Amino acid sequence: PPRGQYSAGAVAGLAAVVGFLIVFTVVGNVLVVIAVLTSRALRAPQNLFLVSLASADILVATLVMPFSLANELMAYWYFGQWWCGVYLALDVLFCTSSAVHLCAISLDRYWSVTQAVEYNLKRTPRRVKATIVAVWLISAVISFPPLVSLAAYPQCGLNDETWYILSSCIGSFFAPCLIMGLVYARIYRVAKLRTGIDCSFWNESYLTGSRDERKKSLLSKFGMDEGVTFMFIGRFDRGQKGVDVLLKAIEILSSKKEFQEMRFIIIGKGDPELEGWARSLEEKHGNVKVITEMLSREFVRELYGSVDFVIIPSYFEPFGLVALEAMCLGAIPIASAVGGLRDIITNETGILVKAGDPGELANAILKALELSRSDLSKFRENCKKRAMSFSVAQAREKRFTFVLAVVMGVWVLCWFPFFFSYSLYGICREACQVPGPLFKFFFWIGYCNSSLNPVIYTVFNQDFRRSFKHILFR
Amino acid sequence: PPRGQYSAGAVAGLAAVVGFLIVFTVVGNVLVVIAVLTSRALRAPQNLFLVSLASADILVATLVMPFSLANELMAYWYFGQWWCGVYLALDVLFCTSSAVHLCAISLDRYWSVTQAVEYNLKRTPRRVKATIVAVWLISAVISFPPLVSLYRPQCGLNDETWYILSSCIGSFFAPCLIMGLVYARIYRVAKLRTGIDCSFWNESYLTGSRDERKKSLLSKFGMDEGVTFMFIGRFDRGQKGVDVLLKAIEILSSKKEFQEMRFIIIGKGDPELEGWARSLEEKHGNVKVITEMLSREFVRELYGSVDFVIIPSYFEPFGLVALEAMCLGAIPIASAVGGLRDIITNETGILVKAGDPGELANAILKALELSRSDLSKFRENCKKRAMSFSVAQAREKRFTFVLAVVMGVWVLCWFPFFFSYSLYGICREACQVPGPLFKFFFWIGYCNSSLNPVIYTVFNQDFRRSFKHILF
Ligand SMILES: CC(C)CCC[C@@H](C)[C@H]1CC[C@H]2[C@@H]3CC=C4C[C@@H](O)CC[C@]4(C)[C@H]3CC[C@]12C
Ligand SMILES: CC(C)CCC[C@@H](C)[C@H]1CC[C@H]2[C@@H]3CC=C4C[C@@H](O)CC[C@]4(C)[C@H]3CC[C@]12C
Ligand SMILES: CCS(=O)(=O)N1CCC[C@@H]2CN3CCc4cc(OC)ccc4[C@H]3C[C@@H]21
Ligand SMILES: CCS(=O)(=O)N1CCC[C@@H]2CN3CCc4cc(OC)ccc4[C@H]3C[C@@H]21
Ligand SMILES: CCCCCCCC/C=C\CCCCCCCC(=O)O
Ligand SMILES: CCCCCCCC/C=C\CCCCCCCC(=O)O
Known part of the structure; x- marks a missing residue:
């Protein structure tokens, strides 16, 4: 051994x-x-x-x-x-x-x-x-x-x-x-x-004001009448956030009789040429409120819980945080079926347009108006629930x-x-x-x-x- | 070698x-x-x-x-x-x-x-x-x-x-x-x-104007706008000091200043003080006695809508109510005991002596005097002092x-x-x-x-x- x-x-x-x-x-x-x-x-x-x-x-x-x-x-x-x-x-x-x-x-x-x-x-x-x-x-x-x-x-x-x-x-x-x-x-x-x-920040922790009341207060503060509101935030660029798709879609909407029923709140300071196109539409139409200013997180949350729809017309959007934080406050997204927006938004929680075509967007804003006249109360709750769950x-x-x-x-x-x-x-x-x-x-x-x-x-x-x-x- | x-x-x-x-x-x-x-x-x-x-x-x-x-x-x-x-x-x-x-x-x-x-x-x-x-x-x-x-x-x-x-x-x-x-x-x-829980108790998480929040709160209670005071906790003689506030309300109710003030008193427990509170609620459609267990989120809304938070405590080692209230913007009226005296200073809130309803009623009558002018600096001093803690x-x-x-x-x-x-x-x-x-x-x-x-x-x-x- x-x-x-x-x-x-x-x-x-x-x-x-x-x-x-x-x-x-x-x-x-x-x-x-x-x-x-x-x-x-x-x-x-x-x-x-x-x-x-x-x-x-x-x-x-x-x-x-x-x-x-x-x-x-x-x-x-x-x-x-x-x-x-x-x-x-x-x-x-x-x-x-x-x-x-x-x-x-x-x-x-x-x-x-x-x-x-x-x-x-x-x-x-x-x-x-x-x-x-x-x-x-x-x-x-x-x-x-x-x-x-x-x-x-x-x-x-x-x-x-x-x-x-x-x-x-x-x-x-x-x-x-x-x-x-x-x-x-x-x-x-x-x-x-x-x-x-920011789960805690992006919520209607007011539990004080009414949706129609916050909307009227918002539309009076800017200088408009009570109607179907549409809203954009983010960089003014043709390459990504696609503000050009929305400005072109508004130019298609202006020629229509349903433009008077619509209110538009565009935000961004990305491109000087696009800023000019935006403010020219603000000058040409009273239904348009272009804000080139840098609005604090406190202001955008006020906007989301007032506007009926949020337009997210991105060419490329890998996460789509704007859609999530907007849906938490009750805004129904109108986004391009791109990256992160394709993952979040469902049939019950929003409208998915095709990226790049303004005719595709303009037709969705019309569909949004057709839905607006009825009880939007339950459609907004599906948006809040999806945003939290996701x-x-x-x-x-x-x-x-x-x-x-x-x-x-x-x-x-x-x-x-x-x-x-x-x-x-x-x-x-x-x-x-x-x-x-x-x-x-x-x-x-x-x-x-x-x-x-x-x-x-x-x-x-x-x-x-x-x-x-x-x-x-x- | x-x-x-x-x-x-x-x-x-x-x-x-x-x-x-x-x-x-x-x-x-x-x-x-x-x-x-x-x-x-x-x-x-x-x-x-x-x-x-x-x-x-x-x-x-x-x-x-x-x-x-x-x-x-x-x-x-x-x-x-x-x-x-x-x-x-x-x-x-x-x-x-x-x-x-x-x-x-x-x-x-x-x-x-x-x-x-x-x-x-x-x-x-x-x-x-x-x-x-x-x-x-x-x-x-x-x-x-x-x-x-x-050591070799x-x-x-x-x-x-x-x-x-x-x-x-x-x-x-x-x-x-x-x-x-x-x-x-x-x-x-x-x-x-x-x-x-600063990850929760923050006025940044609240939406809307505070004045618009205080108006809507009073509207839910069917009350007219006025300097809203709140007490939070349980109904007992000692620790909380409900008995100092209910007795302090009695001195104010016998003055033309009570008209202006509004009260949101929250206490649960023994029916002795609870009956005294409910009788003051029946006596004055100005006082609102809440007994039911209130949600953590609704207290955050109250701290961020009410003007002043009353802490008439005899013994308070930590003073978390005050910290939670201060982080939301509420100006506290508290007795200078233990932790409260260690949180609240001259610039942050109103410190008093525990056990005297006349000293608390005088502080409530000093709170009303202060509210007549802009209180926004006091609230910004409240958030600042509490978040540093x-x-x-x-x-x-x-x-x-x-x-x-x-x-x-x-x-x-x-x-x-x-x-x-x-x-x-x-x-x-x-x-x-x-x-x-x-x-x-x-x-x-x-x-x-x-x-x-x-x-x-x-x-x-x-x-x-x-x-x-x-x-x-
Ligand atoms: C749950 C875990 C963390 C328990 C840890 C057990 C460790 C301390 C044990 C498990 C097996 C052990 C080893 C097993 C075999 C040898 C070879 C011997 O020539 C020297 C010790 C040595 C290298 C041991 C060292 C300690 C050892 C690594
Ligand atoms: C950047 C830092 C964290 C690196 C860590 C260094 C380690 C890997 C080094 C430091 C000194 C080294 C040891 C020094 C001396 C001996 C004894 C020799 O008979 C075998 C190797 C052994 C055991 C070495 C193994 C590796 C060792 C433990
Ligand atoms: C002391 C002899 S030994 O040093 O030769 N030996 C045999 C016994 C186990 C020991 C540890 N394990 C871990 C996995 C492992 C993976 C390898 O990569 C393929 C190659 C060897 C080892 C083995 C083999 C080692
Ligand atoms: C194998 C030589 S040796 O074993 O004799 N040796 C001398 C060299 C260093 C080694 C490691 N260090 C760490 C601290 C340390 C603390 C002690 O507790 C008091 C006792 C010894 C050790 C030493 C001494 C070791
Ligand atoms: C005082 C130390 C506490 C001891 C318990 C934890 C020790 C576990 C880790 C390593 C042990 C490895 C085995 C070495 C012991 C061999 C037995 C022997 O010394 O004869
Ligand atoms: C925190 C401790 C770090 C532990 C990591 C260990 C990694 C060391 C691994 C191998 C050491 C290689 C040394 C080879 C030279 C020694 C050869 C010789 O003895 O002649």
């Missing part, structure tokens, strides 16, 4: 902490599976990647972690040649699937914010099951289990070839880290530009994405010492070999990562916290 | 990573020093501890860290017997001073939490600078044994079984016990929720949190080594963690010196804003 490097005390001690770890990883991750499959707030199809990731951790804990310790403590591989090959393939496989899982999850967070409309109709359990199958096959192809292995008292070790060490470090850690970084870099640019609405949906999804970045960062920091050390040995071998005891500790920090995701979810997410509390405490 | 384990390449790579780490630790912690000694957000005296703790971590990077690595790579102590004793003495002192600093900070937050106002005036820069020396001295009485025990060409530390075990308890486990127990008391008073509490709330993280991170960094060193003292080669792993463990320890400026950037907005102001 080979002399062991571990005393009885060290064996009992190490088997106890690792024993503790295995149990902690299993119950925690089993609880994650349970939370996703039971919690209403967590039963979304994209959350199945977390179920699949939890299993990768449950199986390192049961199929790999005990043999890593037993092999260490014993100074030899006792479990036979067959289980050596299966143990080595899995160890690499389960490590590799966490890497590929974090790439799949990252992309899913990226496309949900960017391609919100198109992507979410593809966020189906069957489609998610297809991607989880794909991550597992990519993890098997990357891991390539058929050749990982290779004796008086036998040993169980990996292939020592240079091309292999490096191929496997890149495929299983360095390239998945490059993908995750790049995707999360693209997520934090979008998250910075598509900032969430905003709270996006705030909580923006939060879930952050938690998932924490999951990704903690994984990268847990495996970096090992992969950095294993890569160096692949390169300079002996001249840069991390000592045996440090190398061993480095892949144990790696194994410890399997127990961490359930702590991250608990700490950073209320829905997993509540699910865990409901199971654990009654 | 002996040659190192480290090849020419390793030496170069290791010197570059320790080299980088030393530079990172120095610039980062130097940035913490400048941040506390320049930013008005960090001009609170308690922050000076983080300048002394930044100084500790700079000295680690500069005076001990190059020698730890130099000694390692070289396989012996090249620098001589005198620098061996100073290097070892300092290396232990900077580790203990970090543990003791985190006992001084932990205990500072505890007195901040326990004795709220009396031991807040005590926190002075000259008082804190004395604690910084107290902690630096205590650190020496721990690092360098009072038993005038020796190699450069080893004293190997005696009892120096090993007493030193781990003194520099790590005892300060880890203090930190934990003190923060156990801290998070026990954190559940009080004594913080003003909410930011002072939030700055204290964050600071206590960011420092639970610093302490938590320090323990995780030193636990591997201090547990390893302790085990060794007990069972020696029977539980000796391997040479390389033991050496890495104290380098995890040395890495903690660069982490603190990263912890502040991430978790404290004031330091993040300060570091952006220095570096751009």
Whole structure:
């Protein structure tokens, strides 16, 4: 028998902490599976990647972690040649699937914010099951289990070839880290530009005045009569916010007999040529109130809770905050079916015109007038309800994405010492070999990562916290 | 005579990573020093501890860290017997001073939490600078044994079984016990929720004109416009002081000035005062007694429509009603008791004496005198004084949190080594963690010196804003 490097005390001690770890990883991750499959707030199809990731951790804990310790403590591989090959393939496989899982999850967070409309109709359990199958096959192809292995008292070790060490470090850690970084870099640019609405500020917290009363007060303050009001804010530009589409549509409306029934409040100081076209229409028509001034947030909220409709005629609008904050106060949007406006507005919450054509806009303003004569009271409440529901949906999804970045960062920091050390040995071998005891500790920090995701979810997410509390405490 | 384990390449790579780490630790912690000694957000005296703790971590990077690595790579102590004793003495002192600093900070937050106002005036820069020396001295009485025990060409530390075990308890486990127990008391008073929800109680969240809001409110009650006074809370003799207001209304009702005034009194509980209020509501179609539980949003609307908020409290330690009322624009008429006397000044509101209805009726009659002219400046003084209190509490709330993280991170960094060193003292080669792993463990320890400026950037907005102001 080979002399062991571990005393009885060290064996009992190490088997106890690792024993503790295995149990902690299993119950925690089993609880994650349970939370996703039971919690209403967590039963979304994209959350199945977390179920699949939890299993990768449950199986390192049961199929790999005990043999890593037993092999260490014993100074030899006792479990036979067959289980050596299966143990080595899995160890690499389960490590590799966490890497590929974090790439799949990252992309899913990226496309949900960017391609919100198109992507979410593809966020189906069957489609998610297809991607989880794909991550597992990519993890098997990357891991390539058929050749990982290779004796008086036998040993169980990996292939020592240079091309292999490096191929496997890149495929299983360095390239998945490059993908995750790049995707999360693209997520934090979008998250910075598509900032969430001031939920508390954009609300009719007056609970004092009436809609028709606020409208009459507003239209008297500007210098008009009581009628169907239309309103524009934002930069005066042909390239994006599309003020030109509205000014041209008003020129089409002026030639009509229904122009007298309509009131228009245009705002912006973007283009000198467009400002002139705007104020010339204010000079030519008394139904037009052009305000080139910079109106404070306090003034625009007063405007939204008075005007019947808000015209958002953008060529490109990735978020459409103006639509959301306007809908919260009761203004019915008339927007171009572009980017973020296509996502927010429904049949019950507004009118979606085609971007660029003023004839498309003018015809909608006429349709708006036809709807105005009847009970607009219930149509305005669908706008208020949608704006809140969409905003709270996006705030909580923006939060879930952050938690998932924490999951990704903690994984990268847990495996970096090992992969950095294993890569160096692949390169300079002996001249840069991390000592045996440090190398061993480095892949144990790696194994410890399997127990961490359930702590991250608990700490950073209320829905997993509540699910865990409901199971654990009654 | 002996040659190192480290090849020419390793030496170069290791010197570059320790080299980088030393530079990172120095610039980062130097940035913490400048941040506390320049930013008005960090001009609170308690922050000076983080300048002394930044100084500790700079000295680690500069005076001990190059020698730890130099000694390692070289396989012996090249620098001589005198620098061996100073290097070892300092290396232990900077580790203990970090543990003791985190006992001084932990205990500072505890007195901040326990004795709220009396031991807040005590926190002075000259008082804190004395604690910084107290902690630096205590650190020496721990690092360098009072038993005038020796620390021990190699450069080893004293190997005696009892120096090993007493030193781990003194520099790590005892300060880890203090930190934990003190923060156990801290998070026990954190559940009080004594913080003003400024993310809600803000007149910015209200829409329309305040005059138009006060008109519509009175219109809902079917009342004519006039100087609207409000009382909020429960109906009881003591704490709230409903009995001081109902009796104060009786002095005013017997005067031609009551005509002008309007009352929105909100109380629930015992029918003794409730019957007295309802009778005054039946007697005067000018007073409106509300008993039912009112929504958090409707109170925000009342604070932002009514002219004055009456707080006739006998005992009021915090005075949140006043802070919530002030943040909405309402001018308070409150008794100068506990917290109210600490919030309301001469320019913000009207302070009185608890228990006298004649003094409160006189204050209500002074409120009516004031309302006849523009009150807008008083309200702008009300919001200004109350929001400065909410930011002072939030700055204290964050600071206590960011420092639970610093302490938590320090323990995780030193636990591997201090547990390893302790085990060794007990069972020696029977539980000796391997040479390389033991050496890495104290380098995890040395890495903690660069982490603190990263912890502040991430978790404290004031330091993040300060570091952006220095570096751009
Ligand atoms: C839930 C988590 C955070 C628990 C953490 C358990 C940690 C402390 C345990 C789990 C497995 C352990 C390792 C198992 C094997 C070895 C090899 C031996 O030659 C030195 C100790 C070392 C390197 C152990 C160090 C401590 C270790 C990493
Ligand atoms: C910017 C900061 C946070 C980077 C952190 C620096 C880390 C990675 C550095 C600092 C000092 C280094 C250690 C110095 C000494 C030894 C002992 C040797 O037998 C193995 C390598 C080992 C254990 C090094 C590993 C890496 C190390 C711990
Ligand atoms: C001490 C022998 S050993 O150092 O050779 N060894 C076999 C036992 C487990 C240990 C850690 N795990 C984590 C994942 C993983 C991923 C890889 O990328 C493909 C490559 C190896 C490792 C393995 C293998 C390690
Ligand atoms: C392997 C040599 S050694 O093990 O003997 N050694 C000398 C070099 C530094 C190393 C780490 N530092 C951190 C602070 C520190 C605090 C203590 O608590 C009082 C006790 C020792 C340590 C030292 C000493 C270590
Ligand atoms: C006073 C410290 C508190 C101890 C409990 C927490 C320790 C858990 C972390 C690492 C332990 C690793 C196992 C090392 C012990 C081996 C047993 C032995 O020494 O004989
Ligand atoms: C907070 C502590 C930081 C922990 C991160 C660990 C990352 C270090 C990883 C690998 C170290 C590489 C050193 C290789 C040179 C040593 C070779 C030799 O001993 O001859």
